[PDB]
């Protein structure tokens, strides 16, 4: 009612010569917010021998206060490719590992799994056994050394493997006929596939997972979790910054 | 008889609005399945001195459960170029080798062979002798160091050398007039040629063979070996995966 | 024939935001196509074309009773890190950044029964003084009049007023780009009702949409919860 200002008048609000543009919104571009490296996870290695476990690239669980945590929670359905950096930190005296040969293998959404030592390198007694799937072949293997290695890390790009045209970050259903608990918001292969780190370290070190999700596609906006306690009435939420009264 | 559905009718099956395409089959492209690195073999070195043995690049024997094992067994006749990676692992305390100079030489399908020390490097007493054919020349030599060498490996491409327009991965015949055992599925130079690794390590290390076969050409499909035990009646074959009830 | 190269000083350093990508190790993957509706492109769109519901003492509405006068009914420090925003979309989206910019639209939906009527002065008070405390005090400023019983819902635009080309998504001890003012709804009259024994009060929901000129910048990582 009445609209454009100055007259006390009922529905009549005042004028607003709305703003110009700068930045063209671009930072809030879902594809851009997601194409960078995130420190998601931290895990330890496996000994070259034993009958070890594969690890799963599932950045959909969350709960850890991390920005990329939420954001993936912001949408119902997601699709993007993957990109890694694995860094391996030291947890003892760095002079313990002279070699430090690390085997890594990537497993695509839905690959077979049981592995036991099965490859045997020998030479001058002693002789090493690497893992049955640590080996090089079909799924990409990546071997790197950490011995003065100016950056104890390795890295690469890996495609959207799932058999699902998109991934439901939420699922009002079960992924199995047996409607068991655990099988709730599940639906199998709703992730990026898996990896196996294995080495004569394993002890002496932890890892550093890092994902970069290029080509981000987000479908169906969802409620965006608060992330901070509710401040008191009629007040602000004061925080420490690059600004502030010095 | 009758064909397109709904009428109880004899030969009459129901309808099938067959599928769309995605992936264009491309993964099953023999040329693509083969152009990557495979951990085929594992061997030890030879001392710079003695009267050593050449090694043969024959990835046609098989028996080892390895995917690339079968696949080469999938065809009667094969042709592709070769590509290597040799990595040298350590089998003792990595601080034993200060130098670690390794001589490698590649020998094309049908090269001469007897080698004894024959090259003498001298300087300040002691003096090293390398192998008569370890030397650099006609067949490619590759020398690399493993002393902090951030990747104790070396690598290169080598052409289809054989005098056979193609290689019979199977041979109902003998390769010699003397129809002896051993000379059965043989026919000489039905492989890629050979290599010689030699170094002041030899002890202190094993190797890591890896082939990549570009330009794969496969002629005459053959039966493809099962690879898993026969499961029980009317059941599936349950296996561990990236999916599965968690 | 080998190229002549010098190894730039940082050479083996990592850096987590490289404008470039890593090396592929699993090519030739063609993916299945997706019809799946509502793929959003940019976060500002849902924030603009979408109303969130405010936060006052725990509920998303404010009350009018058959007794009120000039006591301000709704008040908020115009800052994203303000209270009555805490629950909302816009506010929470902005946590993902450093600087905000523009006007915000407020939607008040009076929800008292039809037998009922009332009026309010929604006003915006510029960040100088020490905050007004009565209608007759705020009235001299930017405000309009809402007679519930003409529209049962009304929109009000909290403008962008600042030497600040951009503003602070993360406010704190009062700075010059920390606050843009104060939103206040006052009670112009009180609750008239057919029968005051049934309808004695009214609940005006208050929602927040993002401003058309609204924008966000400089993505940031999360500090310690607080």
């Amino acid at each position: 009612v009445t609209n454009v200002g100055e007259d006390g008048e009922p529905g009549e609000t005042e004028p607003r010569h709305a703003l110009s543009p700068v930045d063209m919104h671009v930072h809030t571009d879902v594809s851009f917010l997601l194409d960078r490296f995130f420190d998601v996870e931290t895990l330890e290695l496996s000994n070259l021998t034993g009958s070890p476990a594969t690890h799963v690239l599932d950045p959909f669980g969350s709960t850890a206060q991390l920005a990329w945590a939420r954001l993936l929670n912001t949408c119902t359905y997601f699709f993007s490719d993957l990109e890694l950096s694995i860094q391996f930190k030291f947890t003892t005296t760095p002079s313990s590992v002279g070699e430090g040969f690390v085997w890594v293998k990537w497993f695509p959404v839905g690959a077979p799994t049981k592995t036991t030592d099965a490859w045997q390198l020998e030479g001058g007694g002693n002789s090493v056994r690497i893992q049955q799937l640590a080996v090089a072949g079909m799924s990409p293997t990546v071997v790197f050394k950490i011995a003065g290695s100016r950056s104890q890390a390795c890295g690469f790009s890996v495609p959207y493997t799932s058999m699902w045209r998109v991934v439901p970050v939420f699922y009002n259903g079960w992924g199995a006929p047996t409607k068991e608990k655990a099988t709730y918001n599940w639906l199998p292969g709703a992730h990026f596939g898996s990896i196996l780190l294995t080495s004569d370290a394993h002890d002496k070190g932890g890892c550093y997972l890092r994902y970069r999700f290029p080509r981000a596609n987000m479908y169906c906006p969802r409620p965006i979790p608060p992330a901070f306690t509710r401040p008191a009435d009629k007040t602000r939420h004061k925080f420490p910054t690059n600004i502030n009264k010095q | 008889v009758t064909n397109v559905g709904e009428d109880g009718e004899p030969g009459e099956t129901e309808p099938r609005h067959a599928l769309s395409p995605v992936d264009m089959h491309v993964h099953t492209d023999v040329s693509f399945l083969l152009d990557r690195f495979f951990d085929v073999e594992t061997l030890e070195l030879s001392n710079l001195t003695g009267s050593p043995a050449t090694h043969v690049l024959d990835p046609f024997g098989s028996t080892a459960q390895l995917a690339w094992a079968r696949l080469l067994n999938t065809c009667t006749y094969f042709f592709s170029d070769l590509e290597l990676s040799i990595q040298f692992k350590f089998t003792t305390t990595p601080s034993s080798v200060g130098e670690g100079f390794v001589w490698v030489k590649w020998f094309p399908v049908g090269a001469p062979t007897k080698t004894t020390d024959a090259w003498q490097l001298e300087g300040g007493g002691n003096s090293v002798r390398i192998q008569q054919l370890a030397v650099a020349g006609m067949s490619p030599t590759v020398v690399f160091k493993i002393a902090g060498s951030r990747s104790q490996a070396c690598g290169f491409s080598v052409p289809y050398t054989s005098m056979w327009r193609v290689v019979p991965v199977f041979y109902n015949g003998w390769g010699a007039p003397t129809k002896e055992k051993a000379t059965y599925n043989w026919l000489p130079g039905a492989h890629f040629g050979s290599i010689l690794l030699t170094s002041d390590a030899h002890d202190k290390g094993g190797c890591y063979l890896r082939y990549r076969f570009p330009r794969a050409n496969m002629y005459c499909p053959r039966p493809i070996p099962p690879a898993f035990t026969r499961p029980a009646d009317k059941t599936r074959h349950k296996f561990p995966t990236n999916i599965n009830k968690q | 024939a080998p190229i002549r190269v010098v190894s730039v000083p940082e050479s083996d350093s990592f850096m987590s935001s490289v404008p470039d990508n890593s090396t592929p190790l699993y090519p030739k993957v063609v993916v299945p196509p997706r019809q799946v509706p509502g793929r959003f492109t940019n976060f500002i769109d849902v924030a603009k074309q979408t109303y969130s519901f405010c936060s006052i003492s725990g509920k998303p509405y404010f009350e009018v009773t058959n007794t009120s006068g000039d006591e301000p009914l709704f008040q908020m420090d115009v800052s994203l890190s303000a209270a009555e925003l805490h629950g909302t979309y816009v506010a929470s989206l902005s946590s993902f950044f450093a600087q905000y910019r523009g006007s915000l639209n407020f939607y008040f939906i009076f929800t008292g029964a039809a037998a009922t009527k009332a009026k309010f002065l929604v006003a915006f008070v510029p960040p100088h003084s020490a905050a007004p405390k009565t209608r007759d005090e705020a009235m001299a400023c930017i405000h309009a009049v809402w007679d519930v019983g003409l529209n049962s819902a009304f929109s009000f635009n909290v403008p962008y007023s600042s030497p600040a080309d951009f503003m602070a998504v993360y406010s704190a001890e009062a700075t010059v780009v920390n606050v843009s003012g104060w939103l206040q709804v006052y009670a112009l009259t009180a609750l008239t009702s057919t029968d005051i024994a049934v309808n004695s009060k009214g609940r005006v929901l208050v929602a927040v949409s993002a401003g058309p000129d609204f924008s966000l910048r400089h993505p940031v990582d999360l500090p310690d919860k607080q």
Binding site: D35, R36, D81 | - | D20, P27, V29
Partner: peptide, 21 residues
């Protein structure tokens, strides 16, 4: 979105990433 170099296409559009229909 965020890929900005020139060498970003050092590898093919086909090899590098994934491809829709």
């Amino acid at each position: 979105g965020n890929s900005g170099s020139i060498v970003q296409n050092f590898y093919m559009q086909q090899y590098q990433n994934s491809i829709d229909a």
